[PDB]
PDB file of N, CA and C in Angstrom:
ATOM      1  N   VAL A   1     109.199-164.525 -92.351  1.00  0.00           N
ATOM      2  CA  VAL A   1     109.059-164.435 -90.903  1.00  0.00           C
ATOM      3  C   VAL A   1     110.173-165.256 -90.270  1.00  0.00           C
ATOM      4  N   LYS A   2     110.886-164.654 -89.326  1.00  0.00           N
ATOM      5  CA  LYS A   2     112.107-165.226 -88.788  1.00  0.00           C
ATOM      6  C   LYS A   2     111.972-165.535 -87.304  1.00  0.00           C
ATOM      7  N   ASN A   3     112.852-166.413 -86.826  1.00  0.00           N
ATOM      8  CA  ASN A   3     112.933-166.779 -85.413  1.00  0.00           C
ATOM      9  C   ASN A   3     111.625-167.351 -84.899  1.00  0.00           C
ATOM     10  N   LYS A   4     110.929-168.102 -85.739  1.00  0.00           N
ATOM     11  CA  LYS A   4     109.657-168.686 -85.364  1.00  0.00           C
ATOM     12  C   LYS A   4     109.490-169.992 -86.117  1.00  0.00           C
ATOM     13  N   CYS A   5     108.910-170.983 -85.453  1.00  0.00           N
ATOM     14  CA  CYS A   5     108.813-172.313 -86.045  1.00  0.00           C
ATOM     15  C   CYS A   5     107.785-172.242 -87.161  1.00  0.00           C
ATOM     16  N   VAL A   6     108.262-172.102 -88.392  1.00  0.00           N
ATOM     17  CA  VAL A   6     107.414-171.802 -89.534  1.00  0.00           C
ATOM     18  C   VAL A   6     107.619-172.855 -90.608  1.00  0.00           C
ATOM     19  N   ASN A   7     106.520-173.340 -91.162  1.00  0.00           N
ATOM     20  CA  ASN A   7     106.597-174.252 -92.287  1.00  0.00           C
ATOM     21  C   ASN A   7     107.011-173.464 -93.520  1.00  0.00           C
ATOM     22  N   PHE A   8     108.051-173.926 -94.207  1.00  0.00           N
ATOM     23  CA  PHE A   8     108.669-173.135 -95.261  1.00  0.00           C
ATOM     24  C   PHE A   8     108.794-173.966 -96.520  1.00  0.00           C
ATOM     25  N   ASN A   9     108.670-173.314 -97.670  1.00  0.00           N
ATOM     26  CA  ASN A   9     108.905-173.944 -98.961  1.00  0.00           C
ATOM     27  C   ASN A   9     109.664-172.955 -99.836  1.00  0.00           C
ATOM     28  N   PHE A  10     110.961-173.190-100.022  1.00  0.00           N
ATOM     29  CA  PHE A  10     111.868-172.241-100.665  1.00  0.00           C
ATOM     30  C   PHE A  10     112.219-172.766-102.047  1.00  0.00           C
ATOM     31  N   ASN A  11     111.977-171.960-103.078  1.00  0.00           N
ATOM     32  CA  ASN A  11     112.148-172.412-104.457  1.00  0.00           C
ATOM     33  C   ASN A  11     111.404-173.717-104.673  1.00  0.00           C
ATOM     34  N   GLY A  12     110.382-173.933-103.863  1.00  0.00           N
ATOM     35  CA  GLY A  12     109.751-175.220-103.822  1.00  0.00           C
ATOM     36  C   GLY A  12     110.544-176.300-103.125  1.00  0.00           C
ATOM     37  N   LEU A  13     111.447-175.904-102.223  1.00  0.00           N
ATOM     38  CA  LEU A  13     112.252-176.884-101.448  1.00  0.00           C
ATOM     39  C   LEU A  13     111.305-177.606-100.483  1.00  0.00           C
ATOM     40  N   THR A  14     110.587-176.820 -99.662  1.00  0.00           N
ATOM     41  CA  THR A  14     109.555-177.228 -98.658  1.00  0.00           C
ATOM     42  C   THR A  14     110.202-177.688 -97.339  1.00  0.00           C
ATOM     43  N   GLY A  15     109.384-177.953 -96.315  1.00  0.00           N
ATOM     44  CA  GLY A  15     109.903-178.421 -95.016  1.00  0.00           C
ATOM     45  C   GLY A  15     109.475-177.536 -93.858  1.00  0.00           C
ATOM     46  N   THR A  16     109.896-177.911 -92.647  1.00  0.00           N
ATOM     47  CA  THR A  16     109.597-177.201 -91.414  1.00  0.00           C
ATOM     48  C   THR A  16     110.887-176.907 -90.669  1.00  0.00           C
ATOM     49  N   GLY A  17     111.042-175.668 -90.228  1.00  0.00           N
ATOM     50  CA  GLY A  17     112.204-175.286 -89.449  1.00  0.00           C
ATOM     51  C   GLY A  17     111.979-173.912 -88.871  1.00  0.00           C
ATOM     52  N   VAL A  18     112.980-173.424 -88.154  1.00  0.00           N
ATOM     53  CA  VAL A  18     112.958-172.073 -87.613  1.00  0.00           C
ATOM     54  C   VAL A  18     113.912-171.218 -88.424  1.00  0.00           C
ATOM     55  N   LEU A  19     113.363-170.262 -89.155  1.00  0.00           N
ATOM     56  CA  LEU A  19     114.142-169.427 -90.053  1.00  0.00           C
ATOM     57  C   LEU A  19     114.870-168.372 -89.242  1.00  0.00           C
ATOM     58  N   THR A  20     116.192-168.391 -89.297  1.00  0.00           N
ATOM     59  CA  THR A  20     117.009-167.405 -88.615  1.00  0.00           C
ATOM     60  C   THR A  20     118.104-166.919 -89.546  1.00  0.00           C
ATOM     61  N   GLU A  21     118.564-165.696 -89.313  1.00  0.00           N
ATOM     62  CA  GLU A  21     119.686-165.189 -90.085  1.00  0.00           C
ATOM     63  C   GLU A  21     120.944-165.985 -89.780  1.00  0.00           C
ATOM     64  N   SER A  22     121.734-166.238 -90.816  1.00  0.00           N
ATOM     65  CA  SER A  22     122.957-167.014 -90.702  1.00  0.00           C
ATOM     66  C   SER A  22     124.148-166.127 -91.013  1.00  0.00           C
ATOM     67  N   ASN A  23     125.127-166.114 -90.111  1.00  0.00           N
ATOM     68  CA  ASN A  23     126.338-165.350 -90.365  1.00  0.00           C
ATOM     69  C   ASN A  23     127.219-166.012 -91.410  1.00  0.00           C
ATOM     70  N   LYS A  24     127.018-167.301 -91.675  1.00  0.00           N
ATOM     71  CA  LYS A  24     127.857-167.996 -92.642  1.00  0.00           C
ATOM     72  C   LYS A  24     127.700-167.378 -94.020  1.00  0.00           C
ATOM     73  N   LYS A  25     128.815-167.259 -94.724  1.00  0.00           N
ATOM     74  CA  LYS A  25     128.887-166.524 -95.981  1.00  0.00           C
ATOM     75  C   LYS A  25     128.963-167.501 -97.152  1.00  0.00           C
ATOM     76  N   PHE A  26     127.914-167.519 -97.970  1.00  0.00           N
ATOM     77  CA  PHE A  26     127.962-168.277 -99.209  1.00  0.00           C
ATOM     78  C   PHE A  26     128.979-167.670-100.159  1.00  0.00           C
ATOM     79  N   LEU A  27     129.565-168.513-101.001  1.00  0.00           N
ATOM     80  CA  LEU A  27     130.178-168.007-102.211  1.00  0.00           C
ATOM     81  C   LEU A  27     129.066-167.640-103.183  1.00  0.00           C
ATOM     82  N   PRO A  28     129.309-166.658-104.055  1.00  0.00           N
ATOM     83  CA  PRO A  28     128.199-166.079-104.835  1.00  0.00           C
ATOM     84  C   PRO A  28     127.391-167.093-105.612  1.00  0.00           C
ATOM     85  N   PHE A  29     128.023-168.133-106.148  1.00  0.00           N
ATOM     86  CA  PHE A  29     127.272-169.093-106.952  1.00  0.00           C
ATOM     87  C   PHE A  29     126.444-170.029-106.075  1.00  0.00           C
ATOM     88  N   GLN A  30     126.967-170.439-104.921  1.00  0.00           N
ATOM     89  CA  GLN A  30     126.269-171.450-104.133  1.00  0.00           C
ATOM     90  C   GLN A  30     124.855-171.003-103.800  1.00  0.00           C
ATOM     91  N   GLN A  31     123.955-171.966-103.691  1.00  0.00           N
ATOM     92  CA  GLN A  31     122.571-171.656-103.404  1.00  0.00           C
ATOM     93  C   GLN A  31     122.048-172.333-102.148  1.00  0.00           C
ATOM     94  N   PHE A  32     122.266-173.632-101.980  1.00  0.00           N
ATOM     95  CA  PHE A  32     121.700-174.358-100.852  1.00  0.00           C
ATOM     96  C   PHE A  32     122.829-174.862 -99.975  1.00  0.00           C
ATOM     97  N   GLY A  33     122.735-174.604 -98.694  1.00  0.00           N
ATOM     98  CA  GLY A  33     123.686-175.175 -97.777  1.00  0.00           C
ATOM     99  C   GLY A  33     123.398-176.635 -97.510  1.00  0.00           C
ATOM    100  N   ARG A  34     124.308-177.276 -96.782  1.00  0.00           N
ATOM    101  CA  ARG A  34     124.099-178.640 -96.328  1.00  0.00           C
ATOM    102  C   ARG A  34     124.945-178.928 -95.101  1.00  0.00           C
ATOM    103  N   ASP A  35     124.662-180.073 -94.490  1.00  0.00           N
ATOM    104  CA  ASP A  35     125.169-180.425 -93.175  1.00  0.00           C
ATOM    105  C   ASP A  35     126.258-181.487 -93.316  1.00  0.00           C
ATOM    106  N   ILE A  36     126.863-181.879 -92.191  1.00  0.00           N
ATOM    107  CA  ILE A  36     127.753-183.038 -92.174  1.00  0.00           C
ATOM    108  C   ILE A  36     126.987-184.298 -92.551  1.00  0.00           C
ATOM    109  N   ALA A  37     125.727-184.373 -92.159  1.00  0.00           N
ATOM    110  CA  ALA A  37     124.871-185.491 -92.507  1.00  0.00           C
ATOM    111  C   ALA A  37     124.136-185.284 -93.816  1.00  0.00           C
ATOM    112  N   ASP A  38     124.480-184.240 -94.563  1.00  0.00           N
ATOM    113  CA  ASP A  38     123.837-183.942 -95.839  1.00  0.00           C
ATOM    114  C   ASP A  38     122.334-183.716 -95.663  1.00  0.00           C
ATOM    115  N   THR A  39     121.975-182.832 -94.736  1.00  0.00           N
ATOM    116  CA  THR A  39     120.612-182.333 -94.610  1.00  0.00           C
ATOM    117  C   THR A  39     120.613-180.818 -94.759  1.00  0.00           C
ATOM    118  N   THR A  40     119.545-180.281 -95.340  1.00  0.00           N
ATOM    119  CA  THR A  40     119.465-178.849 -95.589  1.00  0.00           C
ATOM    120  C   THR A  40     119.536-178.078 -94.283  1.00  0.00           C
ATOM    121  N   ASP A  41     120.514-177.183 -94.164  1.00  0.00           N
ATOM    122  CA  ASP A  41     120.617-176.340 -92.987  1.00  0.00           C
ATOM    123  C   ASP A  41     120.741-174.861 -93.288  1.00  0.00           C
ATOM    124  N   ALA A  42     121.201-174.482 -94.474  1.00  0.00           N
ATOM    125  CA  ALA A  42     121.305-173.083 -94.861  1.00  0.00           C
ATOM    126  C   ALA A  42     120.692-172.920 -96.238  1.00  0.00           C
ATOM    127  N   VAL A  43     119.893-171.879 -96.416  1.00  0.00           N
ATOM    128  CA  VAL A  43     119.192-171.651 -97.668  1.00  0.00           C
ATOM    129  C   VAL A  43     119.366-170.193 -98.058  1.00  0.00           C
ATOM    130  N   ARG A  44     119.338-169.920 -99.357  1.00  0.00           N
ATOM    131  CA  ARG A  44     119.307-168.560 -99.870  1.00  0.00           C
ATOM    132  C   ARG A  44     117.896-168.183-100.286  1.00  0.00           C
ATOM    133  N   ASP A  45     117.415-167.066 -99.767  1.00  0.00           N
ATOM    134  CA  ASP A  45     116.080-166.600-100.099  1.00  0.00           C
ATOM    135  C   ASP A  45     116.039-166.242-101.578  1.00  0.00           C
ATOM    136  N   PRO A  46     115.095-166.783-102.347  1.00  0.00           N
ATOM    137  CA  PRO A  46     115.100-166.510-103.794  1.00  0.00           C
ATOM    138  C   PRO A  46     114.928-165.045-104.140  1.00  0.00           C
ATOM    139  N   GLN A  47     113.930-164.384-103.566  1.00  0.00           N
ATOM    140  CA  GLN A  47     113.615-163.029-103.989  1.00  0.00           C
ATOM    141  C   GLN A  47     114.713-162.051-103.603  1.00  0.00           C
ATOM    142  N   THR A  48     115.147-162.088-102.355  1.00  0.00           N
ATOM    143  CA  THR A  48     116.251-161.263-101.905  1.00  0.00           C
ATOM    144  C   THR A  48     117.372-162.188-101.476  1.00  0.00           C
ATOM    145  N   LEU A  49     118.585-161.884-101.920  1.00  0.00           N
ATOM    146  CA  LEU A  49     119.711-162.797-101.742  1.00  0.00           C
ATOM    147  C   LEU A  49     120.202-162.699-100.303  1.00  0.00           C
TER     148      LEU A  49
ATOM    149  N   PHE B   1     118.183-196.223-100.930  1.00  0.00           N
ATOM    150  CA  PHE B   1     117.573-197.518-100.642  1.00  0.00           C
ATOM    151  C   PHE B   1     116.700-198.000-101.792  1.00  0.00           C
ATOM    152  N   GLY B   2     117.028-197.569-103.003  1.00  0.00           N
ATOM    153  CA  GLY B   2     116.184-197.889-104.140  1.00  0.00           C
ATOM    154  C   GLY B   2     114.843-197.189-104.145  1.00  0.00           C
ATOM    155  N   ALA B   3     114.817-195.918-103.762  1.00  0.00           N
ATOM    156  CA  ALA B   3     113.660-195.059-103.939  1.00  0.00           C
ATOM    157  C   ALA B   3     114.108-193.806-104.672  1.00  0.00           C
ATOM    158  N   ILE B   4     113.144-193.015-105.139  1.00  0.00           N
ATOM    159  CA  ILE B   4     113.487-191.939-106.062  1.00  0.00           C
ATOM    160  C   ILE B   4     114.345-190.887-105.378  1.00  0.00           C
ATOM    161  N   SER B   5     114.113-190.636-104.096  1.00  0.00           N
ATOM    162  CA  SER B   5     114.909-189.643-103.392  1.00  0.00           C
ATOM    163  C   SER B   5     115.087-190.032-101.937  1.00  0.00           C
ATOM    164  N   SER B   6     116.273-189.753-101.405  1.00  0.00           N
ATOM    165  CA  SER B   6     116.538-190.052-100.005  1.00  0.00           C
ATOM    166  C   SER B   6     115.761-189.125 -99.083  1.00  0.00           C
ATOM    167  N   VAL B   7     115.411-187.934 -99.559  1.00  0.00           N
ATOM    168  CA  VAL B   7     114.636-187.010 -98.742  1.00  0.00           C
ATOM    169  C   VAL B   7     113.189-187.466 -98.705  1.00  0.00           C
ATOM    170  N   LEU B   8     112.659-187.657 -97.502  1.00  0.00           N
ATOM    171  CA  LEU B   8     111.268-188.073 -97.394  1.00  0.00           C
ATOM    172  C   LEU B   8     110.327-187.001 -97.911  1.00  0.00           C
ATOM    173  N   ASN B   9     110.601-185.740 -97.588  1.00  0.00           N
ATOM    174  CA  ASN B   9     109.678-184.675 -97.960  1.00  0.00           C
ATOM    175  C   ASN B   9     109.576-184.530 -99.469  1.00  0.00           C
ATOM    176  N   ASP B  10     110.693-184.693-100.177  1.00  0.00           N
ATOM    177  CA  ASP B  10     110.654-184.608-101.631  1.00  0.00           C
ATOM    178  C   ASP B  10     109.652-185.599-102.200  1.00  0.00           C
ATOM    179  N   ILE B  11     109.713-186.852-101.747  1.00  0.00           N
ATOM    180  CA  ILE B  11     108.753-187.851-102.202  1.00  0.00           C
ATOM    181  C   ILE B  11     107.335-187.406-101.898  1.00  0.00           C
ATOM    182  N   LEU B  12     107.095-186.929-100.683  1.00  0.00           N
ATOM    183  CA  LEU B  12     105.748-186.511-100.320  1.00  0.00           C
ATOM    184  C   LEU B  12     105.304-185.315-101.143  1.00  0.00           C
ATOM    185  N   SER B  13     106.227-184.405-101.438  1.00  0.00           N
ATOM    186  CA  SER B  13     105.855-183.194-102.153  1.00  0.00           C
ATOM    187  C   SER B  13     105.454-183.495-103.589  1.00  0.00           C
ATOM    188  N   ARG B  14     106.192-184.372-104.264  1.00  0.00           N
ATOM    189  CA  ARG B  14     106.001-184.514-105.703  1.00  0.00           C
ATOM    190  C   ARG B  14     104.885-185.501-106.038  1.00  0.00           C
ATOM    191  N   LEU B  15     104.945-186.725-105.519  1.00  0.00           N
ATOM    192  CA  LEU B  15     103.990-187.753-105.915  1.00  0.00           C
ATOM    193  C   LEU B  15     103.049-188.090-104.766  1.00  0.00           C
ATOM    194  N   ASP B  16     101.770-188.245-105.100  1.00  0.00           N
ATOM    195  CA  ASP B  16     100.682-188.394-104.137  1.00  0.00           C
ATOM    196  C   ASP B  16     100.562-189.846-103.667  1.00  0.00           C
ATOM    197  N   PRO B  17      99.796-190.102-102.600  1.00  0.00           N
ATOM    198  CA  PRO B  17      99.937-191.362-101.837  1.00  0.00           C
ATOM    199  C   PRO B  17      99.908-192.634-102.674  1.00  0.00           C
ATOM    200  N   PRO B  18      98.998-192.794-103.645  1.00  0.00           N
ATOM    201  CA  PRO B  18      98.876-194.129-104.266  1.00  0.00           C
ATOM    202  C   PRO B  18     100.182-194.666-104.817  1.00  0.00           C
ATOM    203  N   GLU B  19     101.006-193.813-105.422  1.00  0.00           N
ATOM    204  CA  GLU B  19     102.335-194.258-105.823  1.00  0.00           C
ATOM    205  C   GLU B  19     103.373-193.962-104.747  1.00  0.00           C
ATOM    206  N   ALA B  20     103.072-193.037-103.834  1.00  0.00           N
ATOM    207  CA  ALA B  20     104.036-192.706-102.790  1.00  0.00           C
ATOM    208  C   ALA B  20     104.333-193.910-101.912  1.00  0.00           C
ATOM    209  N   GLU B  21     103.323-194.734-101.644  1.00  0.00           N
ATOM    210  CA  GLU B  21     103.505-195.836-100.708  1.00  0.00           C
ATOM    211  C   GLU B  21     104.595-196.786-101.173  1.00  0.00           C
ATOM    212  N   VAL B  22     104.654-197.066-102.472  1.00  0.00           N
ATOM    213  CA  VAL B  22     105.681-197.972-102.973  1.00  0.00           C
ATOM    214  C   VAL B  22     107.062-197.379-102.747  1.00  0.00           C
ATOM    215  N   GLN B  23     107.204-196.077-102.977  1.00  0.00           N
ATOM    216  CA  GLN B  23     108.484-195.432-102.719  1.00  0.00           C
ATOM    217  C   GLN B  23     108.813-195.439-101.234  1.00  0.00           C
ATOM    218  N   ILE B  24     107.869-195.015-100.396  1.00  0.00           N
ATOM    219  CA  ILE B  24     108.163-194.859 -98.975  1.00  0.00           C
ATOM    220  C   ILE B  24     108.392-196.205 -98.309  1.00  0.00           C
ATOM    221  N   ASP B  25     107.657-197.236 -98.719  1.00  0.00           N
ATOM    222  CA  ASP B  25     107.893-198.553 -98.135  1.00  0.00           C
ATOM    223  C   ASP B  25     109.325-199.002 -98.351  1.00  0.00           C
ATOM    224  N   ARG B  26     109.988-198.459 -99.366  1.00  0.00           N
ATOM    225  CA  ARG B  26     111.388-198.790 -99.572  1.00  0.00           C
ATOM    226  C   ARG B  26     112.268-198.117 -98.527  1.00  0.00           C
ATOM    227  N   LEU B  27     112.029-196.835 -98.260  1.00  0.00           N
ATOM    228  CA  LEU B  27     112.814-196.135 -97.251  1.00  0.00           C
ATOM    229  C   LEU B  27     112.586-196.720 -95.865  1.00  0.00           C
ATOM    230  N   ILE B  28     111.338-197.032 -95.529  1.00  0.00           N
ATOM    231  CA  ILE B  28     111.062-197.560 -94.200  1.00  0.00           C
ATOM    232  C   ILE B  28     111.806-198.863 -93.993  1.00  0.00           C
ATOM    233  N   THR B  29     111.815-199.722 -95.006  1.00  0.00           N
ATOM    234  CA  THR B  29     112.581-200.953 -94.899  1.00  0.00           C
ATOM    235  C   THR B  29     114.055-200.657 -94.717  1.00  0.00           C
ATOM    236  N   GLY B  30     114.583-199.719 -95.495  1.00  0.00           N
ATOM    237  CA  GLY B  30     115.997-199.413 -95.399  1.00  0.00           C
ATOM    238  C   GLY B  30     116.362-198.733 -94.098  1.00  0.00           C
ATOM    239  N   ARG B  31     115.710-197.613 -93.793  1.00  0.00           N
ATOM    240  CA  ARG B  31     116.069-196.873 -92.594  1.00  0.00           C
ATOM    241  C   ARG B  31     115.940-197.746 -91.363  1.00  0.00           C
ATOM    242  N   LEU B  32     114.856-198.510 -91.269  1.00  0.00           N
ATOM    243  CA  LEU B  32     114.647-199.329 -90.085  1.00  0.00           C
ATOM    244  C   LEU B  32     115.723-200.392 -89.959  1.00  0.00           C
ATOM    245  N   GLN B  33     116.167-200.960 -91.078  1.00  0.00           N
ATOM    246  CA  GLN B  33     117.265-201.912 -90.994  1.00  0.00           C
ATOM    247  C   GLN B  33     118.510-201.252 -90.437  1.00  0.00           C
ATOM    248  N   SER B  34     118.799-200.032 -90.875  1.00  0.00           N
ATOM    249  CA  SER B  34     119.960-199.335 -90.345  1.00  0.00           C
ATOM    250  C   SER B  34     119.791-199.043 -88.867  1.00  0.00           C
ATOM    251  N   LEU B  35     118.599-198.618 -88.461  1.00  0.00           N
ATOM    252  CA  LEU B  35     118.357-198.388 -87.044  1.00  0.00           C
ATOM    253  C   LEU B  35     118.499-199.669 -86.254  1.00  0.00           C
ATOM    254  N   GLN B  36     118.007-200.772 -86.799  1.00  0.00           N
ATOM    255  CA  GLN B  36     118.058-202.022 -86.063  1.00  0.00           C
ATOM    256  C   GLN B  36     119.491-202.469 -85.850  1.00  0.00           C
ATOM    257  N   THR B  37     120.337-202.310 -86.863  1.00  0.00           N
ATOM    258  CA  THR B  37     121.729-202.698 -86.708  1.00  0.00           C
ATOM    259  C   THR B  37     122.418-201.859 -85.647  1.00  0.00           C
ATOM    260  N   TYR B  38     122.199-200.547 -85.666  1.00  0.00           N
ATOM    261  CA  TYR B  38     122.871-199.687 -84.704  1.00  0.00           C
ATOM    262  C   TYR B  38     122.531-200.089 -83.282  1.00  0.00           C
ATOM    263  N   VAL B  39     121.264-200.391 -83.016  1.00  0.00           N
ATOM    264  CA  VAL B  39     120.897-200.796 -81.667  1.00  0.00           C
ATOM    265  C   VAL B  39     121.607-202.082 -81.287  1.00  0.00           C
ATOM    266  N   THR B  40     121.599-203.072 -82.178  1.00  0.00           N
ATOM    267  CA  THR B  40     122.267-204.326 -81.863  1.00  0.00           C
ATOM    268  C   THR B  40     123.755-204.111 -81.649  1.00  0.00           C
ATOM    269  N   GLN B  41     124.347-203.156 -82.360  1.00  0.00           N
ATOM    270  CA  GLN B  41     125.708-202.766 -82.024  1.00  0.00           C
ATOM    271  C   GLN B  41     125.782-202.260 -80.595  1.00  0.00           C
ATOM    272  N   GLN B  42     124.876-201.358 -80.220  1.00  0.00           N
ATOM    273  CA  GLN B  42     124.953-200.764 -78.894  1.00  0.00           C
ATOM    274  C   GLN B  42     124.728-201.797 -77.810  1.00  0.00           C
ATOM    275  N   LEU B  43     123.735-202.664 -77.979  1.00  0.00           N
ATOM    276  CA  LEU B  43     123.485-203.662 -76.951  1.00  0.00           C
ATOM    277  C   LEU B  43     124.717-204.513 -76.716  1.00  0.00           C
ATOM    278  N   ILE B  44     125.366-204.951 -77.789  1.00  0.00           N
ATOM    279  CA  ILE B  44     126.566-205.754 -77.627  1.00  0.00           C
ATOM    280  C   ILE B  44     127.668-204.933 -76.992  1.00  0.00           C
ATOM    281  N   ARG B  45     127.852-203.697 -77.449  1.00  0.00           N
ATOM    282  CA  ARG B  45     128.918-202.884 -76.881  1.00  0.00           C
ATOM    283  C   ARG B  45     128.632-202.542 -75.429  1.00  0.00           C
ATOM    284  N   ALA B  46     127.374-202.265 -75.094  1.00  0.00           N
ATOM    285  CA  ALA B  46     127.047-201.997 -73.700  1.00  0.00           C
ATOM    286  C   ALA B  46     127.316-203.212 -72.835  1.00  0.00           C
ATOM    287  N   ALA B  47     127.174-204.409 -73.395  1.00  0.00           N
ATOM    288  CA  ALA B  47     127.557-205.599 -72.649  1.00  0.00           C
ATOM    289  C   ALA B  47     129.049-205.605 -72.370  1.00  0.00           C
ATOM    290  N   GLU B  48     129.853-205.177 -73.338  1.00  0.00           N
ATOM    291  CA  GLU B  48     131.289-205.134 -73.114  1.00  0.00           C
ATOM    292  C   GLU B  48     131.635-204.181 -71.985  1.00  0.00           C
TER     293      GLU B  48
END
């Protein structure tokens, strides 16, 4: 469920945020994004990439 | 800050309160010290 303040646990990552589509393009190997402050900001959905 | 993980949620997710408190009390001491220093920086700088 997207664009809604949803409690999420990804690959067992866990946390609360608003899931939205990201235009940023991962390189194929990368899995978890991160911030300037080293906080999770971009994630790859496990089931569908 | 000498705790198992810098992420608070990771600590909460993996280990339950009785041992969690020892871990979290470490972060609270650390984070609060960092917050306290930043404010004292600002108060002095705002005086300038």
